[PDB]
Amino acid sequence: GFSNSNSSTVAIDHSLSLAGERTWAETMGLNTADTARLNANIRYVNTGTAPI
Amino acid sequence: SKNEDQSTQNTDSQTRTISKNTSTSRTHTSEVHGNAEVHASFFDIGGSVSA
């Protein structure tokens, strides 16, 4: 048997898409030369004999 | 002191993607068949041609 054949398919598509996104982000910047700041709590004591 | 400023970032992301799609298609088919046949018996021989 000797069968020939020939087809032609014509198509079309429509589409929707609803994309909802919630993004959480956190960042911690630092400078190695200026990491900390200081503060002293100090008093002055006179154990002498004359005031200054 | 090395005046170098470094930073680290951590990020989390959750995405919900809801998608729709639809389609149609239309196919058109032509076909041309052939055939030949030779039959043989004790005393009966035939032949056949088809398309």
Numbering used by the authors:
A (entry chain A): 323 to 374
B (entry chain B): 272 to 322
Quote the study that presented this structure, word for word.
Following assembly, the anthrax protective antigen (PA) forms an oligomeric translocon that unfolds and translocates either its lethal factor (LF) or edema factor (EF) into the host cell. The toxin functions as a binary A2B toxin, with enzymatic A factors, lethal factor (LF, 91 kDa) and edema factor (EF, 89 kDa), and a cell binding B factor, protective antigen (PA, 83 kDa). Within the endosomal compartment, the acidic environment induces a conformational change in the PA, resulting in the formation of a β-barrel channel that can insert itself into the endosomal membrane. The first α helix and β strand of LF and EF unfold and dock into a deep amphipathic cleft, called the α clamp, which resides at the interface of two PA monomers.
In our PA7-LF channel structure, the LFN (the amino terminal domain of LF) binds two neighboring PA subunits, one denoted as PAN, which binds the N-terminus of LFN, and the other as PAC, which binds the C-terminus of LFN. The cryo-EM density reveals a helix of LFN bound in the α-clamp site, indicating that this site continues to engage the enzymatic factors in the PA channel. This helix of LFN in PA7 α-clamp appears to bind within this site in much the same manner as in the PA8-(LFN)4 pre-channel structure (PDB 3KWV20). However, at 4.6-Å resolution, it is not possible to determine whether hydrogen bonds form within the α-clamp site between LFN β1 and PAN β13. Upon alignment with 3KWV20, nonetheless, β13 in the PA channel and in the PA8-(LFN)4 pre-channel has a highly similar conformation, with the first α-helix (LFN α1) aligning well between the two structures. This alignment indicates that LFN α1 binds within the α-clamp site similarly in both the PA channel and the pre-channel. The catalytic domain of LF is invisible in our EM structure, suggesting that it is flexible. LF α1 is angled downward towards the pore in the α-clamp site, while the amino-terminal end of EF α1 is elevated ~2.9 Å as measured using the carbonyl groups on LF Glu34 and EF Glu24. When bound to the pre-channel, LFN forms numerous stabilizing interactions on its amino and carboxyl terminal subdomains. Upon conversion to the channel conformation, the carboxyl terminal subdomain of LFN destabilizes its interface with PA.
